[PDB]
Amino acid sequence: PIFLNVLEAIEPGVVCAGHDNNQPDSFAALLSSLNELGERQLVHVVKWAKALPGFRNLHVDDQMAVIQYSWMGLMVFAMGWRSFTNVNSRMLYFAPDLVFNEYRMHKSRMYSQCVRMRHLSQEFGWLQITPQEFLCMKALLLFSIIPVDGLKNQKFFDELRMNYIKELDRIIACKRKNPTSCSRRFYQLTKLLDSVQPIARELHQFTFDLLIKSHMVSVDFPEMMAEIISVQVPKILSGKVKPIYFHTQ
Numbered sequence: 001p002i003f004l005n006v007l008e009a010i011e012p013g014v015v016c017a018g019h020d021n022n023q024p025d026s027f028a029a030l031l032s033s034l035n036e037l038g039e040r041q042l043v044h045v046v047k048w049a050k051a052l053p054g055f056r057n058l059h060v061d062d063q064m065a066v067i068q069y070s071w072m073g074l075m076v077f078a079m080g081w082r083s084f085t086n087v088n089s090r091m092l093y094f095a096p097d098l099v100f101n102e103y104r105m106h107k108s109r110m111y112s113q114c115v116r117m118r119h120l121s122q123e124f125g126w127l128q129i130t131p132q133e134f135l136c137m138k139a140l141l142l143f144s145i146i147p148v149d150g151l152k153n154q155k156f157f158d159e160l161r162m163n164y165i166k167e168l169d170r171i172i173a174c175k176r177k178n179p180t181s182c183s184r185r186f187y188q189l190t191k192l193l194d195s196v197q198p199i200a201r202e203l204h205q206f207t208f209d210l211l212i213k214s215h216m217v218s219v220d221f222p223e224m225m226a227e228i229i230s231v232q233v234p235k236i237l238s239g240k241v242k243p244i245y246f247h248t249q
Ligand SMILES: C[C@]12CC[C@H]3[C@@H](CCC4=CC(=O)CC[C@@]43C)[C@@H]1CC[C@@H]2O
Pocket: 031, 034, 035, 037, 038, 041, 072, 075, 076, 079, 093, 094, 203, 206, 207, 210
């Protein structure tokens, strides 16, 4: 089971937000912390993507590209998994030092999005996602958003992505026999993967808006997040980069 040994080996540990929970909950302080958390998770995402099977087959510019388009979806999905395993999805477990309860949801001014993330989180429970299904789904999220005109080497990207689809099909299928089941299950996992995208997009709009007005509102964006949110998020927002959906929406 080489493919899973690797996914299971390179999975990131806990990342702390650095939030001072002694501060009173405020928009400026909650969002600044979520932003630092994002900066910190990006270092780990980069290191993890580059250790994935087949990832350095991609053109070097394409490597930076797929990471910079898909981090939001990756991080949302993983946070939903954390939330699911650490607090049965009752709260959003951004990090051990930044757990959102209902008060933090309203104060962050992202109540509706948080609610949608909580929903995502509860699906892991509703569908009984195994840890192997989770790891393979999250790997496939690295490959689920690309420019409409293609990458530098799109042919490589297509092959890699096809392979990651087959690995997920394999993880479902090391277990079952009479194949209504395997067929139903693949359908649920692809539907769940698709559902990450509309949420990632709401958060794209949100953080963009907020970067634009950050000075007026005392929210800090660190270097990389400011750069990625000014340079790559708008390509998504302007429709020049789009998610790859399994089913028509
Ligand atoms: C992008 C963002 C900072 C980073 C947040 C993001 C919401 C989802 C999220 C979950 C994580 O586990 C890491 C941080 C991130 C990626 C936030 C929405 C508004 C804020 O600007």
